[PDB]
């Protein structure tokens, strides 16, 4: 009902056998660029957020993208999402911690996120008037994040269906995989596919 054509190259990325764990670590979560309440594990394959009350906590990938096609899977168990689970991208300067429960990713000009609980899109947004995407669907444990830096778009696929850009106008930026999380002991996995 919601499917869109994919950007050139994505099909091939999705067709390839999964990348080796070394490739996943190289583009995985950065232990030197995450919330003080987050522990990155297995060299970047996933992170665990420590139980900390009244705190939202983010992480960036190790590598920032400014050209080409980039896609990664996020695996985020349904029962470890809590009130605010957001998936998207951030500049190197987006804040990765705040002292309350919120959609931290997308709450400023440095980050763009999809709230996978509510289905809303956040950029420079405290929540109200945030649009629904797709323009609710249940986001399963796995979702695909698609950053096309040739066209300047961030979009998502679920269950084999690409949903088209969520955010446009991103050309010129350098953007990192990012999430923001609120759930005690949540484990968020990232599997970078390419390019």
């Amino acid at each position: 009902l919601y499917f869109q054509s994919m950007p050139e190259g994505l099909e091939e990325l999705l067709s390839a056998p999964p990348p080796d764990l070394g490739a996943q670590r190289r583009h995985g979560w950065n232990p030197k660029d995450c919330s003080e309440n987050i522990e990155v594990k297995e060299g970047g394959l996933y992170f665990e957020r420590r139980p900390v009350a009244q705190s939202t906590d983010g992480a960036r990938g190790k590598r920032g993208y400014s050209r080409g096609l980039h896609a990664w899977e996020i695996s985020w168990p349904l029962e470890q999402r809590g009130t605010h689970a957001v998936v998207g991208v951030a500049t190197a300067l987006a804040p990765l911690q705040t002292d309350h429960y919120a959609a931290l990713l997308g709450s400023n000009s440095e980050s763009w996120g999809w709230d996978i609980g509510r289905g809303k899109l956040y950029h420079q947004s405290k929540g109200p008037g945030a649009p629904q995407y797709p323009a609710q669907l249940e986001v399963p444990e796995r979702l695909l994040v698609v950053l096309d830096m040739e066209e300047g778009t961030l979009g998502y696929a679920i269950g084999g269906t690409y949903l088209g850009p969520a955010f446009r106008g991103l050309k010129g930026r350098t953007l990192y995989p990012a999430v923001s999380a609120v759930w005690g002991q949540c484990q968020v996995r990232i599997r970078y596919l390419g390019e």
Binding site: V52, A53, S55, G82, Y101, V182, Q185, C186
Partner: peptide
């Protein structure tokens, strides 16, 4: 003894 978000 945890809150809404397991903290």
């Amino acid at each position: 003894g945890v809150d809404i978000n397991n903290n």
